[PDB]
Design a protein around this nucleic acid. Structure first.
Lengths: 223, 117, 50
RNA sequence: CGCGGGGUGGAGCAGCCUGGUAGCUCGUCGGGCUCAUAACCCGAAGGUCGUCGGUUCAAAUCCGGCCCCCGCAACCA
RNA sequence: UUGAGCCUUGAUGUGUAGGAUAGGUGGGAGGCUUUGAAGUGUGGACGCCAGUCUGCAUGGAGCCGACCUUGAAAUACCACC
RNA sequence: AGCUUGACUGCGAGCGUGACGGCGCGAGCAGGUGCGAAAGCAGGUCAUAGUGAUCCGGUGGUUCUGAAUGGAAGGGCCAUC
């Protein structure tokens, strides 16, 4: 005890105060994980943003070349034959009046929700449980729209949501160490420029000093 | 706060009151009580019980400082000078030594009894 | 006086605000009335009155 | 033309380098108890945390507006 | 030496409510641990008196959850601050 | 009472008085609205006190200006206290 066995099998692979590049860091991250299953890659980074200033609160979504590193279950709310057309275009299930039961209890087996403005009344009255879970459709980001058969095709475009918490920490799943190194590189490079586009018009000192990646096995590495 | 578990008790007794202070042997105070500040006025603070409530009230000032085994320094003529100590023992404290440290002025000021009539 | 001048926002998001003299700090009643606009000159809803 | 400490039953004030206990207490109202009034002792009645927001199930504890108070011609050109 | 400040070191969360001690907080049915842990009691340390640790009482590979159900959020396995 | 906000907007043939600054009366067109079944109507209240030019500073817009030249400051003009 207490340093766990799968962390003792990776002795002398990390040294403190060491500098890297993405191609060097992802080859080490693949070497810290020894597990038999397919493991995920998660980012957790601190930003130069002041908790007193309302114009420095960072939250929204983006579309990345490989998304979060997995396929997503998309749900679509609309009426008549266009619900079957949207199911063919890029959705796993139709949004029903009966589906509100799984929503209001918070036991939803889906990742993204799209709605037509005439069906929005089935989920708008559940924004208290969809909002804090990162599942809420919003007219200001085109996820409440009459053209659902193009909006579900954009729900398969590699969607990643982001939201900061206290001390300006922000979190995203971005891949697998089972991926090709050029694939894991292009998705991380796309996350970084989507986050540089998201920089506020006033920031505290240096906005993003480093980028950190982990699997939790042997802990994370910075670039 | 961490327990200090050592100290000296400074007790003073008058005809109508009983006073208690707890110090570390560096001379530094950690708690106080009186038979009056124990919630009594008039001659109710002269009681043998107000001298007990003073002991348990000064012990309430050092309960987190952990002092229970100490030595006593006594001043003044008041009968509470033993009524506070026989009660302090029944409150769970250990007494090592008791020394009477009352001063003896070489007169100076006239004794406050006056009368002169 | 104590009634004082106040400016209204529009539902069109205009830079030009409409002025009236109306209490907010001791006797608020608000105002929404629609008036002439300087950007397309076909009126806009001036509302809320702070 | 502009700033930040304070605002918590009728008054005064803690609560706040853990985000929820509504508190210390003065007065008001009513009983024990001494020769008797008060002290003492046992109790009762009444809170839009100035007032709306941000992040939220949640803000007295952090912030931002709006308001009032503050040593003071806030500048009056 | 000291008000304010900084590099360096070591452990943290019951302010209420439980069945229950959810620091804030993001993921999550498959995984950690495996000559040692489980738990409610007199003794020992501490205590918010609920239990946390320790030898015994004792056991000897678990432990755990989904249904159901408290809660805004959960109670394996584990990041970020 | 119902509807409505014309307490609108670009322009204006002309007329009355005051030493001047100043103050009163108005046909008719142009853009966009409203009342009304429609004719017809509205350029703030029943009308006589609810009140300063200018200098200056703040404030939205603007190549109109701008001293080598291209931006810029300052000024001009339209808005405005």
């Amino acid at each position: 005890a207490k340093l766990t066995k799968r962390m003792r099998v990776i002795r002398e692979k990390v040294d403190a105060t060491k500098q890297y590049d993405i191609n060097e860091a992802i080859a080490l991250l693949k070497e810290l994980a020894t597990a038999k299953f397919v493991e995920s890659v998660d980012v957790a980074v601190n930003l130069g943003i002041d908790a007193r200033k309302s114009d420095q609160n960072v939250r929204g979504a983006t579309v990345l070349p490989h998304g979060t590193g997995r396929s997503v279950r998309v749900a679509v709310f609309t009426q008549g034959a266009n619900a079957e057309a949207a199911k063919a275009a890029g959705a796993e299930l139709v949004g029903m009046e009966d589906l509100a039961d799984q929503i209001k209890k918070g036991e939803m087996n889906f990742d993204v929700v799209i709605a037509s403005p005439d069906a929005m009344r089935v989920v708008g009255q559940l924004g208290q449980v969809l909002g804090p879970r990162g599942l809420m459709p919003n007219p200001k980001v085109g996820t409440v729209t009459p053209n659902v058969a193009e909006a579900v095709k954009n729900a398969k475009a590699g969607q990643v949501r982001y939201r900061n918490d206290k001390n300006g920490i922000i979190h995203t799943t971005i891949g697998k160490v089972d991926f090709d190194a050029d694939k894991l590189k292009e998705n991380l490079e796309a996350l970084l420029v989507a986050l540089k586009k998201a920089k506020p018009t006033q920031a505290k000192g240096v906005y993003i000093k480093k980028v950190s990646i982990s699997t939790t096995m042997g802990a994370g590495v910075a670039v | 706060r961490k327990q200090v578990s050592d100290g000296v008790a400074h007790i003073h007794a008058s005809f109508n009151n009983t006073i208690v202070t707890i110090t570390d042997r560096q001379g530094n105070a950690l708690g106080w009580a009186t038979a009056g500040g124990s919630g009594f006025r008039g001659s109710r603070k002269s009681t043998p019980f107000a001298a007990q409530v003073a002991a348990e009230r000064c012990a309430d000032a050092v309960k987190e400082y952990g002092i229970k085994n100490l030595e006593v320094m006594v001043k003044g003529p008041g009968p509470g000078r033993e009524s506070t100590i026989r009660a302090l023992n029944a409150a769970g404290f250990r007494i090592t030594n008791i020394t009477d440290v009352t001063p003896i002025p070489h007169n100076g000021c006239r004794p406050p009894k006056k009368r002169r009539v | 006086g104590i009634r004082e001048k106040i400016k209204l926002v529009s539902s069109a998001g205009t830079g030009h605000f409409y002025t009236t003299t109306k209490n907010k700090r001791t006797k608020p009643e608000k105002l929404e009335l629609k008036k002439f606009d300087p950007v397309v000159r076909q009126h806009v809803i001036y509302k809320e009155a702070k």
